[PDB]
DNA sequence: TTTTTTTTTTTTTTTT
């Protein structure tokens, strides 16, 4: 009948025994989720992975949610095991969950992941109805839940509800006190009366679920609510977060009752609000645990709000690029404008935990006050629905952005970062949610005027955008690398490329001589050489996803899904999609295949030089040298004219070849960005060839 | 000019939500007088003090009588807020318990004995 | 980061 049924019937009566399936039939992956790997023995020297995965392989007849043996998590770290792929299970085992009444669970123990399936059916029935329970939960554990596939700060699954609506709680005889009242009297108040607070800042989710400790929904969010003049950092615990997080927005008047008051956490950093007149109560913090009756948190509509009392309004620090030009090192600010660039979902390993990762994506916000965008570093703000789907041609507003500057290098690094309390939103056509702000009105007027002028901005999506520009002073580049082996070995590049996980980024420096360079037109000589080694690396491959693509609104879902994070569950294509190549490339000049010879003429490597500067840059000398990959603007050409009377990109080609030819035997320290685009595809691109 | 004048006008202009004095200058206490605390809820678990005091500061230009917050009654219980000592207010409100107002002291930093206490400064409010 | 339930409080004014 089906492979699933046959294997399950074959292995049902032998729990915790590994049997090769009687028949090996390719099965389509229809979903891949990630959850904590508790209940495993942490006594083994190779501590089992902090997370395990569940894969919903689907046969022609049924699809039965299986369990991936944690030893196979390598196939998911590299994204080799993705949704829509065909794999051939080689080893299976049966495990029974002792905290649930149900049938056996198939335990995948060895796979041979192949390629994307030709036909994926999302309507195949579920063999075991238990797997079809609407509040989807992991196969193992009693009250477990699925986390987001890659990062841990993004809500995922059905445990996250959005059903909360305003409620009209009568204030007839409700004892409401002020935050300062608790501040002065919270160690003597046996009972803590009700409160009427308003949200000012909502923080990003935080998962504190360790594998050994037994906790349910280890989710914790810090909300800076302010009742009257006072403000405290309320913190929701346990399973309260996945019942109120997707519903509570900044500016909702909450009525908190049956709460707890304690001492401020020692490592807590309460953010200063926009208004300085308020009192920042930083000695005690209100903890909201899930009380049996659902009266602890009640939100009252604005109509029920009474100006008779004083409630701190939600203010903002909207700033333009011109203002940012003078803003100091660290000054939290809000930004708004028309998105003009979207990066990729890069992942940086957390120092706190080498297993967890962040999910950031470089974006550019355009305004009328400057010719450069804000260049925001957008981390995951626990808003996957917006974060993943943002595209250039739209209005984007991000709040609580911290300035970051670096004058050590000539191209001042004036960019922003997303703090813990940073939120993301896409404003309406007129800017309805933020229309009240004056800067918002100015931005909307600018967009309307420019559109009425028949003008469009150069919109780019995804690509290879290493925003951080390596300085021109190799000494400063080394200084930034404090005893971290700034110059990676010529033979270690293989291992470093083998260490990156899905969409991981890392910057290293190599020492060598320019073996040769062949110009690759994006579409005056075409090739040149400088002139038997121990071994050579063939890493000069530029993938189609690496080339930035001009944005076309007609095809926006396709473009946004080609640079997003890999989906957890399958979604059939809505028709026959286009091809990424048919979209024009935002780059104005082609790449190169610079080959590097080792200092000890023993190891060689092939790397790709993908410059971002336009011919306008090499004419105006906005770049550092002809061997750099980023221009001082670090912004894709504004297309003020599209094509100018300047030396054509074909002329800049050949010119770069001869510029490299100048560095015939010169000892150089090139900075080579290395990233793993997914599957086994890995990119190694040049950034800057430091020369003496 | 006069510190009390500036504080009064500031709390009148900006919302009177325990306005923090924009500028803090040492002020000399000229009198501390007590009376019963009538017209109070007296229903909070931490029952309010039975008596309250009305300090009489002097900034060198005018002397204004200010109603001390009952929360700061310990400073007078311990004789830390006496005549002569020059203090520094840090919070101020504008109570109406109305004609003009009642400059309230919500916080204070009692200092050292003053050497220039003047009994000649006229009352700003008659 | 986690973390719940319970209560305790005595005393000198008004007459119209």
3-state secondary structure A354-380: CCCECCEEEEEEECCCCCCCCCEEEEC
Q: Which two tokens stand for residue B89?
A: 């207010």
Reported structure resolution in angstroms: 4.0
Phi and psi dihedrals of A557, rounded to 5?
-60, -45
Strands of the sheet containing B27-36, edge to edge, are: B86-87, B27-36, B51-58, B63-68, B102-108, B89-95
- Residues A230, A279 contacting (CB under 8 angstroms): yes
CA A571/CA B122 separation, integer angstroms? 82
Residues of B in contact with A310 (CB under 8 A): 15, 17
- Residues B78, B44 contacting (CB under 8 angstroms): no
The nearest CA of chain B is from the CA of A170 a distance in Å of 22
CA A557/CA A578 separation, integer angstroms? 11
CA A589/CA A585 separation, integer angstroms? 10
Phi and psi dihedrals of A106, rounded to 5?
-70, 130
Helix (H), strand (E) counts: chain B: 2, 6
- Residues sharing a CB contact under 8 Å with residue A269, sequence separation 6 or more, in sequence order: none
CA A53/CA A37 separation, integer angstroms? 9
Q: Which two tokens stand for residue A243?
A: 């019942």
Sign, CA dihedral A281-A287-A288-A293, equals negative
DSSP-assigned beta bridge partners for residue A366 = A338
- Residues A70, A93 contacting (CB under 8 angstroms): no
CA dihedral A640, A645, A648, A649 (to 10 degrees): -10
- Residues sharing a CB contact under 8 Å with residue A640, sequence separation 6 or more, in sequence order: none
Full 3-state SS string of A608-625: EECCCCCHHHHHHCCCCC
Run of H or E including A106:
strand A105-110
3-state secondary structure of A47: coil
Q: Where are the beta strands (DSSP E) in A407-504?
A: 415-418, 424-426, 460-461
3-state secondary structure of A686: strand
Q: Which residue on chain B is closest to A309 by alpha carbon?
A: B17
The 8-class DSSP code of residue B48 comes to: P
CA dihedral A605, A610, A615, A620 (to 10 degrees): -80
Give the count of Cβ contacts less than 8 A between chain A and B: 21
CA B64/CA B59 separation, integer angstroms? 9
* Total length of chain A: 692
- Residues B73, B86 contacting (CB under 8 angstroms): no
Distances (CA, A) of A496 to A49, A120, A536, A570: 21, 36, 15, 32
Helix intervals (H) in A254-407? 321-324, 384-387
Phi and psi dihedrals of A433, rounded to 5?
-70, -30
CA A418/CA A392 separation, integer angstroms? 19
Go through chain A and list every residue after which a break occurs, taking a C to next N gap over 2.5 angstroms, comma-separated.
523, 531
A199: left (phi over 0), alpha (psi -120 to 50) or beta: beta
DSSP-assigned beta bridge partners for residue A587 = none
- Interchain proximity B15–A310, CB inside 8 Å: yes
Residue keyed to tokens 């390596």: A470
Identify the CA nearest to A32 among candidates A1, A63, A5. Answer: A63
A351: left (phi over 0), alpha (psi -120 to 50) or beta: alpha
Strands of the sheet containing A51-58, edge to edge, are: A86-87, A27-36, A51-58, A67-68, A105-110, A91-95
CA A680/CA A77 separation, integer angstroms? 11
The 8-class DSSP code of residue A92 comes to: E
- Residues A78, A676 contacting (CB under 8 angstroms): yes
- Interchain proximity A185–B46, CB inside 8 Å: yes
Distances (CA, A) of B2 to A683, B25, B32: 71, 10, 21
CA A36/CA A52 separation, integer angstroms? 6
The 8-class DSSP code of residue A454 comes to: T
Q: What angle do CA A130, A132, A133 make, to 5 degrees?
A: 75
CA A358/CA A151 separation, integer angstroms? 6
> A186 — contact with chain B (CB < 8 Å)?
no
DSSP-assigned beta bridge partners for residue A361 = A378
- Residues A55, A81 contacting (CB under 8 angstroms): yes
- Residues A363, A378 contacting (CB under 8 angstroms): yes
- Residues A151, A349 contacting (CB under 8 angstroms): no
Q: CB-based contacts with strand C under 7 Å?
A: A 190-191, 206, 208, 210, 213, 215, 220, 222, 235, 237-238, 260, 262, 265, 268, 287, 289, 291-292
3-state secondary structure of A456: coil
Taking every pair of C-alpha atoms in chain A, what is the biggest distance, in angstroms?
89
- Interchain proximity A188–B17, CB inside 8 Å: no
- Residues B79, B110 contacting (CB under 8 angstroms): no
Cβ–Cβ contacts within 10 Å for residue B8, how many? 19
The nearest CA of chain B is from the CA of A183 a distance in Å of 12
Q: Which two tokens stand for residue A522?
A: 């994006």
Alpha carbons within 13 angstroms on the beta-carbon side of residue A154 total 23
CA B84/CA A87 separation, integer angstroms? 88
Indicate the burial class of A370 (C-beta count within 10 angstroms; 0-12, 13-18, 19 or more).
middle
Whole-number Å distance, CA B35 to C1' C16? Answer: 28
Identify the CA nearest to A671 among candidates A583, A618, A596. Answer: A596
CA A433/CA A431 separation, integer angstroms? 6
Alpha carbons within 13 angstroms on the beta-carbon side of residue A139 total 26
Whole-number Å distance, CA A5 to C1' C9? Answer: 73
CA dihedral A124, A128, A131, A132 (to 10 degrees): 60
Determine the protein residue whose CA lies at the shortest distance from the C1' of C1. Answer: A265
A678: left (phi over 0), alpha (psi -120 to 50) or beta: left
The 8-class DSSP code of residue A466 comes to: -
- Residues A488, A496 contacting (CB under 8 angstroms): yes
- Residues sharing a CB contact under 8 Å with residue A125, sequence separation 6 or more, in sequence order: A61, A62, A63
Helix intervals (H) in chain B? 3-13, 74-77
CA dihedral A609, A615, A617, A619 (to 10 degrees): 130
CA A343/CA B10 separation, integer angstroms? 50
- Residues A668, A641 contacting (CB under 8 angstroms): no
- Residues A586, A635 contacting (CB under 8 angstroms): no
Q: Where are the beta strands (DSSP E) in A237-343?
A: 253-256, 260-263, 279-280, 284-288, 297-300, 333-342
Cβ–Cβ contacts within 10 Å for residue A524, how many? 12
Helix intervals (H) in A521-614? 557-562
> B15 — contact with chain A (CB < 8 Å)?
yes
- Residues A98, A42 contacting (CB under 8 angstroms): no
CA A5/CA A27 separation, integer angstroms? 13
CA A120/CA A30 separation, integer angstroms? 8
Residue keyed to tokens 């080339």: A547
- Residues B80, B14 contacting (CB under 8 angstroms): no
A120: left (phi over 0), alpha (psi -120 to 50) or beta: beta
3-state secondary structure of A649: helix
- Residues A435, A417 contacting (CB under 8 angstroms): no
CA A327/CA A398 separation, integer angstroms? 17
- Interchain proximity A229–B46, CB inside 8 Å: no
Phi and psi dihedrals of A111, rounded to 5?
-135, 165
Q: A20-23 — which CB contacts under 8 Å span 24+ positions? A: A20/A90, A20/A91, A20/A92, A21/A89, A21/A90, A21/A91, A21/A92
CA A264/CA A315 separation, integer angstroms? 25
CA A516/CA A529 separation, integer angstroms? 4
- Residues A217, A239 contacting (CB under 8 angstroms): yes
Return the residue in A177, A275, A279, A313 with the most chain B beta carbons within 10 A, the one to mutate for interface testing: A279
> A172 — contact with chain B (CB < 8 Å)?
no
Phi and psi dihedrals of A205, rounded to 5?
-55, 155
- Residues A224, A279 contacting (CB under 8 angstroms): no
Q: Which of B15, B17, B46 sits opposite A188 (nearest CB)?
A: B46
Determine the protein residue whose CA lies at the shortest distance from the C1' of C7. Answer: A190
Q: Where are the beta strands (DSSP E) in A480-570?
A: 505-520, 527-529, 535-538, 549-550
Q: Which of A184, A191, A229 sits opposite B71 (nearest CB)?
A: A184
Distances (CA, A) of A54 to A29, A106, A109, A111: 10, 10, 12, 14
């Amino acid at each position: 009948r089906s492979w699933i049924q046959k294997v399950l019937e074959q292995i049902m009566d032998s729990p915790r025994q590994c049997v090769t399936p009687s028949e090996v039939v390719p099965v389509t992956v229809l979903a891949v989720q990630r959850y904590l790997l508790e209940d495993e023995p942490r006594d083994t020297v190779p501590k089992p992975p902090l997370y395990c995965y569940d894969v919903t392989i689907s046969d022609g007849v049924y699809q039965e949610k299986c369990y991936l043996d944690p030893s196979l998590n390598s196939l998911v770290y590299q994204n080799i095991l993705k949704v829509g792929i065909q794999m051939r299970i080689s080893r299976v085992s049966c495990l029974y969950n002792e905290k649930r009444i149900g049938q056996g669970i198939l335990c995948i123990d060895n796979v041979h992941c192949g390629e994307t399936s030709d036909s994926i059916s999302l309507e195949t029935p579920f063999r075991n109805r238990a797997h079809q329970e609407k509040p989807e939960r992991p196969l193992r554990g009693g009250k477990s839940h699925y986390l987001a596939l890659w990062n841990n700060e993004d809500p995922y699954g059905d445990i996250w509800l959005t059903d909360k609506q305003p409620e009209e709680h009568n204030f007839s005889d409700t004892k409401i006190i002020s935050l300062s009242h608790l501040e002065m009297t919270w160690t003597n108040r046996r009972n803590f009366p009700a409160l009427l607070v308003r949200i000012l800042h909502k923080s990003k989710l935080r998962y504190y679920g360790k594998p050994d400790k037994k906790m349910i929904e280890p989710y914790q969010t810090f909300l800076e609510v302010a009742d009257s003049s006072g403000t405290v950092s309320v913190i929701m615990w346990n399973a309260l977060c996945p019942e109120w997080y997707k519903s509570l927005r900044v500016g909702l008047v909450l009525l908190l009752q049956d709460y707890s008051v304690k001492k401020s956490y020692p490592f807590r950093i309460q953010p200063v609000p926009v208004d300085p007149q308020i009192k920042l109560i930083s000695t005690m913090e209100i903890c909201l645990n899930l009380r049996d009756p659902p009266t602890n948190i009640i939100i009252i509509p604005e109509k029920q709000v009474k100006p008779e009392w004083r409630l701190p309004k939600l203010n903002h620090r909207f700033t333009t690029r011109s203002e940012l030009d003078d803003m100091p090192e660290n000054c939290i600010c809000d930004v708004i404008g028309l998105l003009v660039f979207v990066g990729r979902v890069q992942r940086s390993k957390k120092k706190e935990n080498r297993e967890d990762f962040w999910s950031y994506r470089w974006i550019h916000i355009a305004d009328g006050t400057s010719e450069q965008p804000f260049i925001v570093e957008l981390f995951s703000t626990s808003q996957p629905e917006i974060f993943e789907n943002i595209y250039p041609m739209a209005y984007f507003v991000c709040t609580q952005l911290k300035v970051v500057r670096n004058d050590n290098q000539v191209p001042k690094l004036l960019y922003l970062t997303t703090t813990n309390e940073s939120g993301v939103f896409i404003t309406g056509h007129r800017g309805q949610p933020y229309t009240y702000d004056a800067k918002v009105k100015n931005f909307i007027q600018w967009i309307r005027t420019k559109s009425d002028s028949g003008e469009q901005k150069n919109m780019v999506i995804g690509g290879y955008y290493p925003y951080p520009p390596v300085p021109e002073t190799f000494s400063k580049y080394s200084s930034s690398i404090k005893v971290e082996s700034l110059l990676t070995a010529i033979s270690e590049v293989r291992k470093e490329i083998e260490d990156l996980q899905y969409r991981e980024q890392k910057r290293i420096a190599i020492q060598g001589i320019i073996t040769a360079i062949k110009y690759i037109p994006h579409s005056i000589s075409d090739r040149w050489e400088s002139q038997g080694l121990i071994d050579h690396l063939h890493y000069s491959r530029v993938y189609p996803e690496s080339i930035p693509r001009k944005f076309m609104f007609e095809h926006r879902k396709f473009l946004s899904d080609q640079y997003n994070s890999q989906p957890a569950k399958y979604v059939p294509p809505e028709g026959r999609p286009p091809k990424l190549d048919d979209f024009k490339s935002a780059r104005s000049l082609g790449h190169f295949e610079v080959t590097i010879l080792g200092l000890n003429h023993e190891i060689a490597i092939d790397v790709a030089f993908l410059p971002m500067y336009c011919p306008e840059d090499i004419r105006t000398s906005q770049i550092d040298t002809l061997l750099t990959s980023m221009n001082y603007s670090c912004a894709y050409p504004q297309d003020t004219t599209g094509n100018d009377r300047l030396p054509g990109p074909r002329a800049v080609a050949g010119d770069i070849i001869k510029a490299a030819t100048e560095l015939d035997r010169v000892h150089i320290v090139g900075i080579l960005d290395i990233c793993n685009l997914g599957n086994n595809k890995v990119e190694v691109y040049l950034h800057k060839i430091y020369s003496p």
